[PDB]
């Protein structure tokens, strides 16, 4: 059933599983029309499909052309998400197919369940966790590839870069969720924290800066401070 704090270590066991986040699939800018009414302009989206054990990210780019002449787009987006995840499972060899898919939003359960009827052995599961995967579009290189797509495209990343060479999946996922939580609470501050020292760069094949173990401890501390500050602000506490 539902994934929570109590069954957290399960993410890092040897059963292949994917997280699916649909929060950046349908994205609009709201504007005034010449007549002073309001309209939306769709911009490119993405399905965020993440193996939390390996760091493999299947970033399915949603080009705005998939909304052309469609009604009830926020509803269609859940079904388009489910269709793309099903197609991704079908394209993987049997031994790479997930044994579980965890949806970060409950509204994805029925659409994914319906698209995966051919896969009765793949458990479709909600979570109680509040994962900050919506902030994926605050990672510059992910944002860049989505905004530049001129057609539907799948792009493979490792969202952990080369961290697993030095840390466990558990630690890698905790660092990722802290970075994303930070980028979500105060993007400007978070990104300042990540690039303030120009000596530490982002390798061409990476998403995050090449921090030493010691430099990551300092970064991780600055993100926790960022998050607690912003919290005392939000809530005047």
């Amino acid at each position: 059933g539902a994934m929570n704090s109590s069954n957290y270590a399960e993410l890092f066991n040897n059963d292949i599983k994917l997280f699916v986040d649909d929060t950046n699939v349908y994205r609009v800018t709201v504007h005034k029309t010449f007549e002073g009414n309001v309209a939306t302009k769709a911009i490119n989206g993405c399905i965020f499909t993440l193996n939390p054990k390996t760091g493999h990210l299947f970033l399915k780019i949603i080009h705005t052309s998939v909304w052309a002449g469609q009604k009830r787009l926020s509803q269609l987006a859940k079904w388009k998400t489910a269709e793309e995840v099903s197609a991704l499972v079908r394209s993987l060899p049997k031994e790479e197919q997930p044994k579980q898919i965890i949806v970060t939003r409950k509204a994805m359960l029925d659409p994914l369940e319906v698209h995966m009827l051919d896969f009765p052995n793949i458990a479709i599961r909600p979570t109680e966790l509040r994962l900050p995967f919506s902030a994926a579009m605050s990672i510059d290189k992910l944002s860049d590839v989505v905004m530049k797509a001129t057609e539907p495209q799948m792009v493979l990343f490792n969202i952990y870069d080369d961290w697993l060479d030095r840390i466990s999946s558990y630690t890698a996922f905790s660092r990722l969720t802290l970075l994303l939580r930070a980028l979500k609470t105060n993007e400007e501050s978070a990104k300042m924290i990540l690039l303030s020292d120009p000596t530490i760069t982002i390798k061409s094949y990476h998403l995050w800066p090449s921090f030493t173990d010691e430099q990551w401890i300092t970064i991780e501390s600055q993100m926790r401070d960022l998050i607690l500050t912003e919290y005392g602000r939000k809530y005047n506490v």
Partner: protein, 300 residues
């Protein structure tokens, strides 16, 4: 007008005949029920006074044979049986009538309640849901489980209602996932009506049978089936106009007949709110919506 004689009434019992019910005391000289209208199925049903658990009963049609009830003191129940000797039967019934030891099926002349609840229900269809082919009548009780419930465990004593599952390959065509799930028209019209039931009469017959088994035996699986068959029509954007008008009449009489006190366990709040206020057919069941709103406004 046909008769179901009783050999005797050895144990205190509430006897139901269709929508009527009578109290019979232990060893009361009760010898059965007369003036049963020909042309409809009937159900005769029982709740022992000493064990108000296991309601049980027999679906029968008097055109199909001479039926009587006899208490079996081993199995501890009133059992329906067939008398093959026509002259023995006529002779037994004539005696019990002359001695007026029978209750009369108490139909009010104006009252079409039973017709309206059983309009599409046919004994031959009942015998396919309740398989016991050596008998021309069908036994149902409170605890009997449905073929669908057994999938999720004695197959001989199961209710073989048509399996309806909105998240099944049967219900959902490859490449029409969102369309078939949000509009069940192809599931209703091609899979169920054209494919399995053959026509709307057989579909409504099973719907009506499921309801009555829910109300008279509190059979929970029957209740699930009744709600599934309603929800499949309400969730279809495309339903023949005659089926919508008939469904409204069917549900109106079911809601009208439900004991006021059982609304809480026999009516599914999600299915009714969805059907009356959200579904494609939310404006197509006027009679049903007016009776539900005036009789069970709490549920909505």
């Amino acid at each position: 007008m046909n008769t179901v004689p009783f050999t005797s009434a050895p144990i205190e019992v509430t006897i139901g005949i269709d929508q009527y019910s009578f109290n019979v005391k232990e060893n009361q000289p009760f010898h059965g029920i007369k003036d049963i209208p020909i042309g409809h199925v009937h159900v005769i049903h029982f709740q022992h006074a000493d064990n108000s658990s296991m309601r049980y009963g027999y679906w029968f049609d008097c055109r199909m044979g001479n039926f009587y009830i006899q208490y079996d003191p081993k199995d501890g129940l009133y059992k329906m049986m067939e008398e093959r000797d026509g002259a023995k039967f006529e002779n037994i019934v004539h005696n019990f009538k002359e001695r007026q030891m029978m209750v009369s099926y108490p139909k009010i002349d104006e009252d079409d309640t039973w017709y309206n609840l059983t309009e599409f229900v046919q004994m031959d269809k009942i015998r396919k849901i309740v398989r016991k082919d050596e008998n021309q009548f069908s036994y149902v009780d409170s605890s009997m489980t449905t073929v669908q419930e057994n999938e999720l465990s004695d197959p001989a004593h199961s209710l073989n209602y048509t399996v309806i599952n909105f998240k099944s390959r049967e219900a959902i065509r490859p490449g029409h996932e969102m369309e078939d799930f949000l509009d069940k028209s192809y599931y209703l019209n091609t899979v169920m009506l054209q494919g399995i039931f053959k026509n709307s009469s057989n579909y409504f017959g099973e719907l009506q049978f499921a309801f009555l088994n829910a109300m008279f035996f509190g059979n929970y699986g029957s209740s699930l089936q009744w709600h599934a068959m309603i929800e499949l029509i309400c969730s279809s954007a495309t339903v023949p106009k005659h089926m919508l008008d008939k469904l409204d009449e069917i549900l109106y009489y079911q809601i009208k007949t439900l004991p006021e006190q059982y609304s809480d366990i026999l009516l599914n709040e999600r299915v009714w709110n969805i059907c009356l206020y959200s579904s494609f057919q939310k404006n197509s069941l006027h009679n049903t919506e007016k009776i539900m709103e005036n009789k069970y406004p709490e549920l909505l």
